[PDB]
Amino acid sequence: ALRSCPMCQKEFAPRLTQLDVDSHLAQCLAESTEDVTW
Amino acid sequence: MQIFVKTLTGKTITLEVEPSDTIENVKAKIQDKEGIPPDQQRLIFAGKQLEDGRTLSDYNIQRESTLHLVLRLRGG
Amino acid sequence: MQIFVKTLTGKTITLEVEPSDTIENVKAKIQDKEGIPPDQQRLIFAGKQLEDGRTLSDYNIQKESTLHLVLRLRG
Ligand SMILES: [Zn+2]
């Protein structure tokens, strides 16, 4: 589903696979000092 | 069925699971293999942070699916 | 000898080590205490990233030295 990252608002282009998106999300979550929900 | 859990350093953990296994079960398996306490694990798949009480099938996780694992340090 | 490993979450980990211990050995000790796999640990001392095959004495790390531990975001 996700069309943009809920943490950093980067837009997810259609060329990105689900794996790419999950990987991006993981990095954004890890970089945040607090636990985030979305 | 086999799934993969990928860490941020690129390491891949392979797990045998059932579609009805809960996310907590999965974290416990990760602990068994890697020694990481579940409370320090966060899992991501299909645009979602996976919740402990839900099942793999709830998230459409299937054979050879790749989940992403993020670790947290203890706080305090 | 004792060294201190600080995290940005405000935790200080105290470790008992020898000067001849390798960084790999130190990471294993941190895993024992904190449950973080060594491949996910980055250790920094005096602005320098510590390499696994080198020893504490190679970096002039001495009693009551403070290292920093940060989690890796990339391989
Ligand atoms: Zn992001």
Author numbering:
A (entry chain C): 143 to 180
B (entry chain A): 1 to 76
C (entry chain H): 1 to 75
Give the published text:
FAAP20 is a 20 kDa protein, which binds to FANCA through its N-terminal region and contains a conserved UBZ domain in its C terminal extremity. Several publications indicate that K63 chains are recognized by the UBZ domain of FAAP20 (FAAP20-UBZ), which recruits the FA core complex (FANCA, FANCB, FANCC, FANCE, FANCF, FANCG, FANCL, FANCM, FAAP20, FAAP24 and FAAP100) through its interaction with FANCA. The interaction between UBZ and Ub or Ub chains plays important roles in the Fanconi anemia (FA) pathway, which repairs DNA interstrand crosslinks (ICLs) and other replication blocking DNA damage. FAAP20-UBZ contains an α-helix reminiscent of other Ub-binding domain, the following Ub-binding loop and a stabilizing loop at the N-terminal extremity.
To elucidate the mechanism underlying the specific interaction between FAAP20-UBZ and Ub chains, we determined the crystal structure of FAAP20-UBZ (residues 143–180) in complex with K63-linked Ub2 (K63-Ub2) at 1.9 Å resolution. A zinc ion is coordinated by the conserved residues Cys147, Cys150, His166 and Cys170 and bridges the first loop and the α-helix. Both the α-helix and the second loop interact with the distal Ub of K63-Ub2. At the UBZ α helix, the side chains of Leu161, Leu167, Ala168, Leu171 and Ala172 and the aliphatic portion of Asp164 hydrophobically interact with the canonical Ile44-centered hydrophobic patch of Ub, which is formed by the side chains of Leu8, Ile44 and Val70 and the aliphatic portions of Thr66 and His68 side chains. The Asp164 Oδ atoms of FAAP20-UBZ further hydrogen bond with the main-chain amide groups of Ala46 and Gly47 of Ub, respectively. Trp180, which is located at the C-terminal extremity of the second loop of FAAP20-UBZ, also participates in the hydrophobic interaction with Ile44 of Ub.
